[model samples]
Target: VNSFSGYLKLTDNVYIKNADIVEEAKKVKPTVVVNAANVYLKHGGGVAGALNKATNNAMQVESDDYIATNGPLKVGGSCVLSGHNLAKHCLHVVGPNVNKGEDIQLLKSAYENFNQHEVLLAPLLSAGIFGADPIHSLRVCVDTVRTNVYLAVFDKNLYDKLVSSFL
Candidate 1:
């Protein structure tokens, strides 16, 4: 059974949920996970930080390979499916750091720079540790991922709000 007990469709393929990220990860076995990365592939903060810590920084090492060739990543660029760690592959997109303030524009740009497929697991960029009010942050995500996107939310309030919008 999937961890996402319920979901609200945003588009033909896109969906939003308030499910646990790791739980949903198990269910999705995603084709690619959108990693909110930095210029140097430094998976040391936000979702990247947790993922890097899980793989003993192996994911970061592999991501670093892309940097060696692709050079520094910009706020609106993406590092396509370059390596595998938790999922089959990872699509790295640079997002806004809380330290830098809310940057929904760049976040949306990062979201647009992807190839749609079966499934993609994404954290609420700039919402968590980045402190970009989950409500506003999640809106930017829903607006960008026009494909099969499943948002994992750990809070019931956010979940309720997202589901209510489509109701």
Candidate 2:
């Protein structure tokens, strides 16, 4: 019986929810679940790891295959891959690694790269281990996403921080 901790209505279509991204992705069954991926599209840790586990590691294999064919994903770039058990498709976006001198523009590009879909489930890209500030990253997501969106925030503290941003 999992439920959202908080909710914010950004517009008629866009919203933010304090919930687990993975669970929301499963429940909403969006056309594409956005993955906060690295350049290699490695699903080793954080949201990526959780998604990998949720898909029974099929995502990892698919990501590896994609990398083998197309090479490493550049910063702010993205690619769509077949979803395993959760959604119909997975949009893997390489957010800017702020620790590597990547800037906000690249982060914006990462959020802006995806094509249109009926519903999109996304995490706060670059806000985790990639080193981008959570509020800043959330702002980028809020500004760029035009379709139906659920911005999932799994951490309570981080969720509070982001929710506070709109107040």
Candidate 3:
């Protein structure tokens, strides 16, 4: 049972849950890479580059860059998978929304497409375009993976507050 001694508490105030990054990392091993089987940047109808440019000029990562590189910030993560890989970690955030919604199928194919041109690239492992949303990224990622995911956060289980929001 959760004792008064096992958590952080405040006095005479509404509570908000918080977590220690290093501690949680030790408990649930998160993925160290970011990517998906398909990407949805195509929906922009050529405007995806403009979004990229916007993110670059503003010094803020566009949704695509954030999801793929697992970068732009080193704060709390929104990674879709959990595992280890080469280099720094890759986390999938900003769930699927890419290429006018065509990326879903693209993602499923990304798992199997091997031919260079047919594979939609210069014969590389990752799609070259920065996808529009998490769904798009997920499409590319569907083909090759270690595990599937669904979000699960609790109230008392997490700090005596209910985690109830979906979107």
Candidate 4:
């Protein structure tokens, strides 16, 4: 399914899988991709309880201490985890997803470019290929990777918008 990185956390119990989905991806082009870095996403979860505080950690742009993470995270570098996309591994850099062979810098560039114009651009550019939720994906990566991404939207509006388009 076209799901985001199934596992990821803010410097927490990270997970890494060594699967060549890219090679198999030849059968599925327009698919999903979950590329991560130092973070992890393999196992460890519970009912309303995660292995670490990554899930419990709330996102806080003002407070640098506040950590943001998905349900997966590890301390060290792990194998490349790329699925959905043709690439076996995703860009270590965080932000919006881009076209095939897209320069890794595209994410940072877009953010810089957006800041040059408005205060908040509502990263509507990254969709499907990169989890669709610009803020969430970026937020997860950032809080888990860096002290950035002040996403205002609690839920990914893209999914809602997509449903509307079908009508």
Candidate 5:
């Protein structure tokens, strides 16, 4: 895939990126990899799935077990955990399931918990299996992230669309 880097807002804090998320993760050295998760934290598909596999389910196990104990977190809510095989922390947000046509607000609210000092990496979010429009989903992410943000994208069409549409 093509690699690119640029800002989403006029300020430089938020970034839009087109590259391998795993490779970029190493460089970003994120405090957390903010994932678009289901209530059950069953991240076995999309960007979330790839992230789980990359980390050897280190974060996934934590998330799944946490959910098992806490019951399902509803949309517009999240939880953070110390992780291994990736970032020191993992933020799991219960995001919209496009298959279910859930609210988009759930996605934006997830980014609200991010901090300014923390280096955070995220995917296109609801863009994948959630079926949220990439453009709209990205807009919410850029608008919400007040900290250092890396929006990693794997799909070439998504990369081009986001760059041209927003940046």
Candidate 6:
């Protein structure tokens, strides 16, 4: 089932989930899906790749067009685009690369930069190839969240850890 394994409540508006982000977005129909985008905003791999594929690569076209107009996304910066088949909109944020000496502040900025949306769907930013520890990333996510949030998590073990952390 696509239902979340479990979820944590931060406030009336904040929540964390152990589930597929895209699947949850399909069900929840959030205002936007937040992507863990690279500086180039290329949906080449990881969560970005999956999101791109879900949108039938239209997201990549949008990303290219966005860059063509605005320029490459800076670390912790974001841009919005049509979500195509995914949702009403997609927000692409360039997460900090821990190996490059990027700090938690930039990661926090990534989450903080999200615009006002009634419902926002996001994965564990910087927890993939960007190299931030998942637990640390989760903490940052929870700390920085405003409005309503559904943080999608993909790994069972990681999800378990997340659940345990709240207990």
Best by TM-score: 2
What ranges in model 4 sit over 4 Å off?
1-99, 130-167
Flag regions of model 6 displaced more than 4 Å: 1-6, 99-101
lDDT of 6 at 126: 91
Better of 1 and 3 by TM-score: 1
Give the Å shift of residue 127 in candidate 1.
1.3
Error of 2 at 98 (Å): 1.8
True-vs-predicted CA distance for residue 110, candidate 6, Å: 0.9
For all predicted structures, in order, the TM-scores are 0.77, 0.89, 0.22, 0.23, 0.84, 0.88
Candidate 2's displacement at residue 86, Å, is 1.2
* Backbone clashes in model 1: 0
lDDT (Cα, tens digit) per residue for candidate 3, span 1-167: 21112222222211123343222323443332223322322213122232223234321233545446653321111333322222123333222234334333434434332211111110112223423333333334333432322211122343322223211
For model 1, the stretches where C-alpha displacement exceeds 4 angstroms are: 1-5, 8-11, 82-85, 101-103, 115-118, 155-167
lDDT value, candidate 5, whole model: 0.72
The best candidate by lDDT is 2
Tens-digit per-residue lDDT, 1-167, candidate 5: 12224535434666766677776765555677777778888878887788788888776778778977899987877788764666777777676777887877677776576653356777767777888888887777777877777777888888887778874
Residue 21 local lDDT, model 4 = 31
Question: Which 10-residue span in candidate 6 carries the lowest summed lDDT?
Answer: 1-10
- Please report the TM-score between candidate 5 and the true structure: 0.84
Off by over 4 Å in 3: 1-26, 29-88, 91-99, 109-167
lDDT of 2: 0.80
Q: What C-alpha lDDT values do all the predictions have?
A: 0.67, 0.80, 0.28, 0.28, 0.72, 0.78
Error of 1 at 51 (Å): 1.6
**Candidate 1's residue-wise lDDT over 90-145, tens digit each?**
77777766676646567677667553555677776666666566666666666666
Candidate 2 has what TM-score? 0.89
